[PDB]
Amino acid sequence: PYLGFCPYCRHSAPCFSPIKIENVWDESDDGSIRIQVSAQFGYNQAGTADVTKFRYMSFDHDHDIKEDSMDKIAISTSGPCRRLGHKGYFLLAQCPPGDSVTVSITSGASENSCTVEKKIRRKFVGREEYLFPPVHGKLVKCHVYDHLKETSAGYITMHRPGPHAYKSYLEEASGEVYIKPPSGKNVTYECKCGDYSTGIVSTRTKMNGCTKAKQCIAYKSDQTKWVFNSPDLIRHTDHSVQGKLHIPFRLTPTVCPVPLAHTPTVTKWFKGITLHLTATRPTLLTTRKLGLRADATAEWITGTTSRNFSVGREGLEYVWGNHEPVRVWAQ
């Protein structure tokens, strides 16, 4: 549960939150969006799997791992995003179009949000635009993020956390710097107050030659956890790869329904065609000659129009929307 530097917190400014996004994937054909924040979901305080709740980082100088429930998180881009699934470090949700993605935790009045830019556009599959998958239509090949929690699109590498300095650990009194570790936690400290010095103190300890608070650092040795290789953390001295965790919600292939546009009306004349077309939505027409030269043309149309096409003895081919190709040969 690391916390990091979100570019846009609740109010206006970049600041440090436990739920920062760093990267987003939007490649699924159904518009399903997979998100990664520094928080981890579906696990209880010790990390054991518990779907209903999650654990995250604390806003205190002890900086332990705190918890909340699933019902108080929200995802929103332009309107609210419907969540689809969650596995630890990763989320997946369906949501409306927008220019940025927002995660928000609402611990009562304690609101903490992260927003990151991402031009999420409505995408579709086939040769015609449609808002919504129609009830009737052809079944074609598509790729959608698998809603199953136990899939794997890859792995992410985790390391030991690096030093995390604090200032409640330090204090100035009568021009002398003392450390104040919390109870029972062996806190390692170091500084140059003149000559270099390092050690571990578990209790309030005085330093010699130290004249300013800013001169020293103290922090507890928490090696019992693994953190993502995030770009907002100062890493341990040994950044060996130590853990790999799966990237859930693998982009699986499947079938998707797509409309079938209005079949044209062919109005015919000497060596050629005049196709009358109706399409409420942008639909692609693609034609090509069947001889040595293709002379292929592709274009999107809306509304109702008509197109003249010369047909040679070699013939012509046209594909209207998702309909199958159609061939012709002039007389």
Place this chain on the structure above:
Amino acid sequence: PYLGFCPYCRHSAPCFSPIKIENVWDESDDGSIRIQVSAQFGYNQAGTADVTKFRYMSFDHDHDIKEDSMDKIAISTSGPCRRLGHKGYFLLAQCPPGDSVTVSITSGASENSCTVEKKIRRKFVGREEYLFPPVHGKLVKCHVYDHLKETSAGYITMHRPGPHAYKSYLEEASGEVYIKPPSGKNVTYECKCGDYSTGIVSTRTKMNGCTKAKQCIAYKSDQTKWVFNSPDLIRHTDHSVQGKLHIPFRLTPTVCPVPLAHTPTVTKWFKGITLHLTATRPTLLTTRKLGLRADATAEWITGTTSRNFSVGREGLEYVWGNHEPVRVWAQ
């Protein structure tokens, strides 16, 4: 209270919900929207008028009629919509512009929504676009949906419900098909298990020659209700028209306030004019000559601009926005 095959449920798929929209009207000049779902509103359990509650279809194998309140229905297109009226089968509300309309019941955590495409566009009346009806302006003819509950824009035809098979009614045991009607309800059943057979069982009854549960059908004889001629339901054998219910919120004519654009400034020269125009919004200027040839032109302008118009001896006529026509005659 039939339940329709809403193309779009809460999550992503088509399902069967009691609140399926089937068709929408958006012609009213104020943007008021009339919606028709399979649910009804303003009636209590027996059907007697009760504004504060509505009844709808049940999600169970007894499939009775259940109820809820108005306060848990919501209408939304791009943002939330303000309900303006409801009368049995019909709803009316004002909506912000959007591409689809969504009805949603929030029975606590039990969320049931239907969404259907409709390009609702912010429309206006007059010769100039405007966000809102201004406080000051001309009073012009319009047609708005009447908010009164007891109006009638027409009628809708209702018939007896057809057969509604169920699988809780049927069961397989030791390679034999039995029926299990709910308590005290005479349930009609039929199938071919070899030769054909039909009847009614009010209690658990066995069938002979029946080897598969899929072979037969059972359903209770509910002739005490009338259902809309919906395209999602298998009708009764006799689909005679048996009821006509009024289409509320008749599109009544009335008056609207419409803005008056900035009066242009005429700058003049030998046989003609130069109109200086200011208009914060798209506003229509239309002019025509007063001789044999009209040579009329019409165009929408935004911002501030100027237009030169030749004026002959026969004269010129111009209409700026909603202002009255103005005539001129060259010297």
Place this chain on the structure above:
Amino acid sequence: PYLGFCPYCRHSAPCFSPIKIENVWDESDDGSIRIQVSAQFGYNQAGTADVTKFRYMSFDHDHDIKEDSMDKIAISTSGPCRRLGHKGYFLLAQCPPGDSVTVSITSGASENSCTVEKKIRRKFVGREEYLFPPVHGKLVKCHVYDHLKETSAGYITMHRPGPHAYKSYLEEASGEVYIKPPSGKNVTYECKCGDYSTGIVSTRTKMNGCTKAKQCIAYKSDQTKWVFNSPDLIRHTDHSVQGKLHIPFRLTPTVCPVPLAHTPTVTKWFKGITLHLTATRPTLLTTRKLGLRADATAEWITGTTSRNFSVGREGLEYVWGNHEPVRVWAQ
């Protein structure tokens, strides 16, 4: 706390609210928006400063000053707006882009809103578009509304309230006009019922020669308050300037962070340059020759592209986004 004539109340129509907007300012580089409504904020019933509550106008024939809390006012233009500050007559909030601004009080189920048109546009500072102030970038001069409550952008002038008539004060009985002042308040009245007549009644008083209730006017002499010079009030006979109050949230200068675009790649040839440019957002490129003739050109680019520029011996200068100017001299 005057109440005036908003063009758009809750439902559809212009009507009288205590929270009408009259004017809006949107020039702050952050998009912070300063609003003025007829209501007050941060003052308790007597007017003494109390942040958690506000006072406003009453919807009754006694028309006293009523009160409510800050938690039930809301600002929204396209989505909900985050309030930043409040000072008596004035509000300030961050709003998403939109075409109009709405202030709404939700006194439980008593909703009173005013909406006014204002094309608020997402604005930015620098030579490139950006959705949010980036974490890293150049610090440039900007101007933002100072969030401090005790700043002053100016002053506004207040005057004694004018006559404010009512009808509960008047009554028709047996073809005679009587006045019914509320308890203990000396209410001034006047009319011609034939000849002219004026006075003050603190109790139910009869009028002679008065045949219709519409013939007269009564209202209490409330000179113990000062009201804004609003255009929706009938002023007192003596409209002398009698108060000035500060316009909070002065538009103060400060520093703002702005991105640095991708440094272009220069591909060189005989007396000239080919700049290869990448910019996710509209970013401004501006070049000029260093001789007698500037030949300066400026243009916004998106995506990735390339531009050929002839460079003379005298040289060429280009500025890419917020990057510093760069000079070149041909060989």
Place this chain on the structure above:
Amino acid sequence: ENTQLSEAYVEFAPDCTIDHAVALKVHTAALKVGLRIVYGNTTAHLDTF
């Protein structure tokens, strides 16, 4: 016979104190230059018209 006086005028917007344009007329442009002169071993900075 219900007469009304309707009046209006204009002034500066309250935040014009920072958002305002100023109209100027210029005259002959006087140029002043800063120079560094080094002669032999000695250098000097000076501004001259």
